[PDB]
Design an enzyme around this catalytic site. Structure first.
Site, mmCIF file in Angstrom:
data_model
loop_
_atom_site.group_PDB
_atom_site.id
_atom_site.type_symbol
_atom_site.label_atom_id
_atom_site.label_comp_id
_atom_site.label_asym_id
_atom_site.label_seq_id
_atom_site.Cartn_x
_atom_site.Cartn_y
_atom_site.Cartn_z
ATOM 1 N N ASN A 133 -93.466 66.618 -25.230
ATOM 2 C CA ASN A 133 -92.890 65.285 -25.034
ATOM 3 C C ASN A 133 -91.940 65.191 -23.825
ATOM 4 O O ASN A 133 -91.239 64.187 -23.678
ATOM 5 C CB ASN A 133 -92.203 64.804 -26.313
ATOM 6 C CG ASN A 133 -93.064 64.991 -27.536
ATOM 7 O OD1 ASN A 133 -92.657 65.615 -28.524
ATOM 8 N ND2 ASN A 133 -94.295 64.496 -27.474
ATOM 9 N N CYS A 168 -80.170 67.955 -22.692
ATOM 10 C CA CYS A 168 -80.199 68.207 -21.261
ATOM 11 C C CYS A 168 -81.479 67.620 -20.678
ATOM 12 O O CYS A 168 -82.564 67.885 -21.194
ATOM 13 C CB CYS A 168 -80.091 69.709 -20.989
ATOM 14 S SG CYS A 168 -80.389 70.197 -19.261
ATOM 15 N N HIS A 214 -89.188 66.820 -23.168
ATOM 16 C CA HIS A 214 -87.770 67.092 -23.422
ATOM 17 C C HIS A 214 -87.538 68.607 -23.371
ATOM 18 O O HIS A 214 -88.433 69.368 -23.739
ATOM 19 C CB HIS A 214 -87.344 66.565 -24.804
ATOM 20 C CG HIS A 214 -87.545 65.095 -24.991
ATOM 21 N ND1 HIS A 214 -86.629 64.173 -24.513
ATOM 22 C CD2 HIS A 214 -88.552 64.433 -25.605
ATOM 23 C CE1 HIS A 214 -87.111 62.986 -24.841
ATOM 24 N NE2 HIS A 214 -88.265 63.092 -25.504
#
Ligand SMILES: C[C@H]1[C@H](O)CCCN1Cc1ccccc1
Ligand SMILES: C[C@H]1[C@H](O)CCCN1Cc1ccccc1
Lengths: 265, 264
Positions: free
Chosen positions: A186, A223, A188
């Site tokens: 995804n 992050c 991330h």
């Protein structure tokens, strides 16, 4: 891997790979964290998930990790089989807890155990929210009704509050950035990457002479790909204790805090 | 995994994991490179390697990668089984070649193939050594006598000379450093890390709209833990790119290569 007889937990055997081991020829803590992540994905897949329920999809909600606690007694060697058993349990409107038991496939002894606290979050606004009753009913049928804790103990370190590291840090690793290998399906940054970034500030002498026993990690902010992280560490102690802090190198925004415990070989 | 009937090649099935896939939910080229590395380790283990011969240990010689060429037709999806078959062959005293065939365990079709050139070197002085006859005889018994090539085409992409990227590069990713996850059991930076560092300079727009088909990579010098790498890339065209990894400081060349991409 497969669901156990009752359908309330999932088991899976893994063969430790050559690229997954460290200098001591045993699996690294990041490899173990990846195997816990993998068995957790397969548990969701085997019970009907794509991992969101019909109400989670309807409301644009996702499961996000808030805390990861891992304790290892023996790291599997390269070429050894490790059996991981996982299960979920509702923690009321707070969120869900997922536990793991790492066993040796040859002897059957417990060589490690882990616990994690997950919370609900709007995929679009990042606003953490409580688990509604409709969502709760949709996944409770896959959880044991009676509490089954991997860390049940009267005063376990998995539920201990972690303080914020004060400047100056004893050690540090500056300018850490994620690459495409660190991202997930995804886009991330993978939660295991933060474990590796935390341990980057531990001196190489400590790693070469000690074995990582316990690791607790609080997840505050995520992050981005275009973010740069700073890993800060301070000794707080036969054993060695460390306090950790991951923060954005720019503004100093906190993304992670945690503690590790090491023992002499 | 296990050695095949003749004992001249090794096969292994892998189940693609959730953390091993990219945004398109298929295995990344670095995941594929790790599976090739893994099946190669198990092939050495199954033939008697506890990964050097008796003469290599006696002397202080190790196997070092000099070139990696990978071609993928279909990347396995998350949860799919991929069967990799590997084998070795001698290329005279110049070196050793290891090939791989990636097959689909459900249909049996070839979804990818790879080749690599390995050279001998002294673990201590790092000097590129030639292969002696005594070492040759010790491992030839585990190789097919007749040539068995994954890339047999006369004058193909795997044996093509790679030029050096000239400054200025079209794209770049600077300040790349390895972490403990990038090191191997012997504390050297893993060969797969260089593939990931090469692809870091490819724009995200190209990755999002194209699929990586071919990747050739020459290994010139090893990157140490305390070294910083710069990834430089230039389009030379489907999409073709020329790549260069070099030490951020002096500009010492560590890697050069090319990638080929297809529209979806
Ligand atoms: C999203 C995952 C996460 O890994 C832990 C928390 C919830 N879980 C979903 C799940 C899977 C199986 C059975 C019941 C609930
Ligand atoms: C070190 C490895 C390398 O992966 C490829 C080249 C040599 N090989 C050793 C080997 C293994 C099996 C049979 C014959 C030679």
């Amino acid at each position: 891997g497969s669901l156990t007889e009752d359908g309330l937990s999932y088991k899976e055997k893994f063969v430790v790979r050559s690229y997954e081991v460290g200098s001591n020829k045993t699996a690294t803590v990041e490899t173990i964290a990846n195997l816990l992540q993998e068995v957790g994905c397969n548990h969701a897949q085997s019970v009907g998930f794509s991992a969101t329920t019909t109400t989670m999809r309807k409301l644009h909600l996702i499961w996000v990790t808030a805390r990861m606690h891992i304790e290892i007694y023996k790291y599997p060697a390269w070429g050894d089989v490790v059996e991981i058993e996982t299960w979920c349990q509702s923690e009321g409107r707070i969120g869900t807890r997922r536990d793991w038991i790492l066993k040796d496939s040859v002897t059957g002894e417990v060589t490690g155990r882990a616990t994690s606290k997950w919370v609900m979050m709007n995929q679009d606004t990042r606003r953490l929210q409580k688990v509604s009753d409709d969502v709760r009913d949709e996944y409770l049928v896959f959880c044991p009704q009676e509490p089954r804790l991997a860390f049940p103990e009267e005063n376990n370190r998995s539920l201990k509050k972690i303080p914020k590291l004060e400047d100056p840090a004893q050690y540090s690793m500056i300018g850490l950035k994620p690459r495409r290998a660190d991202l997930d399906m995804n886009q991330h940054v993978n939660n295991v990457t933060y474990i590796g970034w935390v341990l980057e500030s531990i001196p190489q002498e400590i790693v070469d002479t000690h074995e990582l026993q316990v690791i607790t990690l609080d997840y505050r902010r995520e992050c981005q790909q275009d973010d740069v992280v700073d890993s800060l560490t301070t000794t707080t102690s036969n054993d060695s204790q460390f306090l950790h802090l991951l923060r954005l190198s720019g503004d100093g925004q906190e993304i992670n805090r945690g503690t590790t415990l090491w023992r002499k070989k």
